[PDB]
Amino acid sequence: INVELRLLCSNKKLLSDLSNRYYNYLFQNSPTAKKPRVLQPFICDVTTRKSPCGQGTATWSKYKMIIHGRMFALQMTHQMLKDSAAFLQNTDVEVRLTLK
Amino acid sequence: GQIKGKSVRTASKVIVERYFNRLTNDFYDNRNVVIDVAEIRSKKLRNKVSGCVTKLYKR
Amino acid sequence: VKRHERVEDDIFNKIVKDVKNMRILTRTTLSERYNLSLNISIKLLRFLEENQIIKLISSHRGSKIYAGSKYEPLKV
C-alpha cells in the first residue's frame, strides 16, 4: 500500500520541475493526490583565505553547497509501483525508495 | 536617498500620457493599473513606478 | 593606630546609650566612630537586633541596614 519516494538534488530548479511533473502524474491518476514535503536542506560549507600568499588585507570567503530534497508519501498497488518506477530514470536528481 | 531615477521616471511619464482616463488619487488603484499595463518583473520596481504615477497624476 | 578585636565593658555600655537617637546605622558606623574591626561590628550589631534595642530594615545579599530609637518612616 504505502511508498515513500525521496527525490534528492543539489539543484533547485530541476527538483521543482521534476516534483511538479510527478505531482501532475499523481493528480492525473487521482489516488487522492497531494503535494511533496519540502525537507530541511543539507548544507556543507568551507571557509578559506582568498590570497595564495600572506600579502595584503586578509580577506575570507565562504563556499556552501546545498542539497535540496523532497519526499512524497503515497498509496499505490504493487503493479502501479513496478510500472511507475519507469519514470525514475535519466535524472540529475537521485531517487530512493522505502516500503512496508 | 529615495530618488526614483531615470528608468522609473521615463516609464511613469509614458503611462500618464496614455492611461490618464484610468487613474485616480489612490496608490492601490494605480498599482492595479501598472500591474496590467506594464511588464515590470521586480517587485521593488513596480512599487516605485506606481508611487511615481500617483504623484504625476495629482500634478 | 589599628582597629580592635574586642568590645570591652565600657565601650559596650556607652554604645547602648549612643545607639538610641541615631536613625539608620550600619556596619561602618560602629567601625569608623569607635575602633572596632568589620568582623566585630557584625557580631555586636547582630546581637543588638536580637535584644530588640535596634531593628533590621534591609538584608539584601550582604548589604544590611538597621534603625534605632528615633527612626520614623514616610506616611501616605
Partner: protein, 142 residues
C-alpha cells in the same frame, strides 16, 4: 469542552507559550511554580506590573500556565510578559463583548506597546577582520 486560548511571545532567542482557561479562582504558574514560590524576582516584578495596569476584576475567574525555552534570564521575563498580556485580550475578544477588549487594549497600549508587540531586535553577525559585529582589529604604523 472548557473555554481556552493559546498565545506566543518572543524576546531575542527566547520563545514562550501561554495557555489560558476558565476557572473558579485566579491561578498562575510559571516553570510549575506559583508567583509566591518562584526563584527569580525580576520575573515576578514584571508579572505584577502588567497585572496592575490591567484591572484585577479582568483577571478574575481565569487560570494561566506559562512554558518557555531559549534566550536567558532577563529576556525570558519579557517574553513571558508578552505571552501573558496577549492571552487576556484574546480571551476577551473570543468569550466576552468586544468593547471590553478595546478598553483593556487602550490601557496596555498607553503603558507599554512592547507588551503586545514583539521587538524585532537580534544580535548582528560577526564580520571578518574584527572581534565582533563592528569593532576592527588594531592597525599599526611604526
Amino acid at each position: 469542552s472548557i473555554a481556552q486560548v493559546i498565545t506566543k511571545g518572543t524576546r531575542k532567542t527566547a520563545i514562550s507559550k501561554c495557555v489560558c482557561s476558565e476557572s473558579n479562582e485566579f491561578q498562575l504558574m510559571v516553570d510549575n511554580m506559583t508567583l509566591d514560590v518562584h526563584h527569580d524576582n525580576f520575573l515576578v516584578a514584571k508579572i505584577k506590573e502588567i497585572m496592575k495596569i490591567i484591572g484585577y476584576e479582568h483577571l478574575e475567574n481565569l487560570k494561566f500556565e506559562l512554558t518557555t525555552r531559549g534566550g536567558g534570564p532577563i529576556s525570558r521575563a519579557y517574553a513571558i510578559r508578552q505571552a501573558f498580556a496577549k492571552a487576556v485580550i484574546s480571551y476577551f475578544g473570543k468569550y466576552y463583548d468586544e468593547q471590553r477588549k478595546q478598553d483593556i487594549k487602550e490601557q496596555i497600549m498607553k503603558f507599554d506597546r512592547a507588551a503586545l508587540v514583539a521587538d524585532p531586535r537580534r544580535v548582528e553577525p560577526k564580520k571578518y577582520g574584527g572581534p565582533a559585529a563592528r569593532a576592527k582589529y588594531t592597525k599599526s604604523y611604526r
